[PDB]
């Protein structure tokens, strides 16, 4: 038996199928990530993503920042994390404005591995991306606040 | 046993969704309503851009203009007497 | 760097990076609107010369001012 096979059976598509790319564990894992919830509202996805990211973002700012050895470490670090959340929300926003026209339909795939048709991800639309960004901002700030609370209150 | 179809150019060029799942929302319904009502104002990209830029600038200006001396050495200023220059210059 | 190494190397490298991006999950969701390519030959000469000149000027300026004002003659 062999381990590496052409991507979805097609040997002339520029990829390969390996345990890293396609195995039950990783497939299940990725398919259950908020980014790949292709049938749910992009808003909620945004909330999850932003929540997790702001939450992790609080960490390195607090301990590595310039005020790490001061009584005002948590405030400073968390504020900085919120700042990066805002900036990244700005980035996401301009990405959405530049990539999708309000009229243009979804650029997401409309097929599955099996080859059957399905509803394209509304994440790849103007409105959908705008919702996702709103979720990243709300969830981002919320996550920063929550992490700060757990760490210093 | 072929991979070329004019009627199906999608499968021909591997335009597949490798990890996208058609599953319904697994999220908390109450929290879903909470976020769908409270995070709504930020779902308009133009308004969100204006809010993030103006609000961000305003916040930055606030924390900057009111920064304590115990945080920024630049606001605390010099605390030691000045040293004279190389050629007796102030 | 820009003056010694020339285009083709970088173009092929960037090709491998483009493949890399189109085959990386999550990141796959983000795509460029302008195809990434290596700088042009002339562009490379210009950018290289610019880094060279700026480095030249700034280095000598720093030395000039520091050496002179450090003692003021």
């Amino acid at each position: 038996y062999q381990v590496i096979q052409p991507i979805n059976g097609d040997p002339f598509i520029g990829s390969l199928e390996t345990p890293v790319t396609s195995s039950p564990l990783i497939a299940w894992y990725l398919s259950n990530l908020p980014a790949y919830r292709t049938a749910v509202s992009p808003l909620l996805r945004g909330i999850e993503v932003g929540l997790a990211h702001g939450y992790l973002l609080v960490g390195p700012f607090v301990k590595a920042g310039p005020l790490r050895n001061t009584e005002i470490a948590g405030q400073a670090g968390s504020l900085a994390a919120g700042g990066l959340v805002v900036i990244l929300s700005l980035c996401l926003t301009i990405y959405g404005i530049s990539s999708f026209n309000e009229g243009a339909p979804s650029t997401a795939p409309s097929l599955t591995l099996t080859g059957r048709k399905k509803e394209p991800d509304q994440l790849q639309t103007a409105d959908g991306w705008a919702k996702f960004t709103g979720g990243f901002f709300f969830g981002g700030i919320s996550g920063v606040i929550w992490a700060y609370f757990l760490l210093y209150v | 046993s072929v991979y070329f179809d004019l009627e199906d150019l999608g499968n021909t060029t591997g335009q597949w969704d490798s990890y996208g799942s058609d599953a319904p929302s697994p999220y908390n319904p109450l929290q879903s309503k909470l976020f769908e009502t409270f995070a709504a104002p930020f779902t308009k990209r133009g308004l969100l851009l204006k809010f993030l830029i103006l609000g961000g600038g305003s916040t930055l200006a606030y924390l900057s203009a009111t920064a304590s001396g115990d945080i920024l050495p630049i606001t605390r200023g010099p605390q030691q007497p000045p040293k004279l220059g190389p050629r007796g210059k102030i | 760097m820009f003056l010694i190494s020339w285009r083709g190397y970088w173009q092929e490298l960037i090709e491998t990076l483009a493949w890399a991006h189109e085959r990386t999950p999550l990141a796959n969701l983000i795509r460029w609107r302008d195809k990434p390519v290596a700088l042009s030959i002339v562009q490379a000469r210009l950018v290289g010369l610019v880094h060279f000149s700026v480095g030249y000027i700034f280095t000598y300026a720093a030395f000039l001012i520091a050496s002179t004002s450090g003692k003021f003659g």
Binding site: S98 | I53, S64, A67 | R33
Partner: peptide, 29 residues
């Protein structure tokens, strides 16, 4: 020292953000 605490982050952070975003959108259109 009063004004610089206002104008420096204004020109060093806000201005280049606004300008870069604007130019990005302009060039991408």
């Amino acid at each position: 020292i009063n004004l610089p605490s206002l104008f420096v982050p204004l020109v060093g952070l806000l201005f280049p953000a606004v300008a870069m975003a604007s130019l990005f959108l302009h060039v991408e259109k």
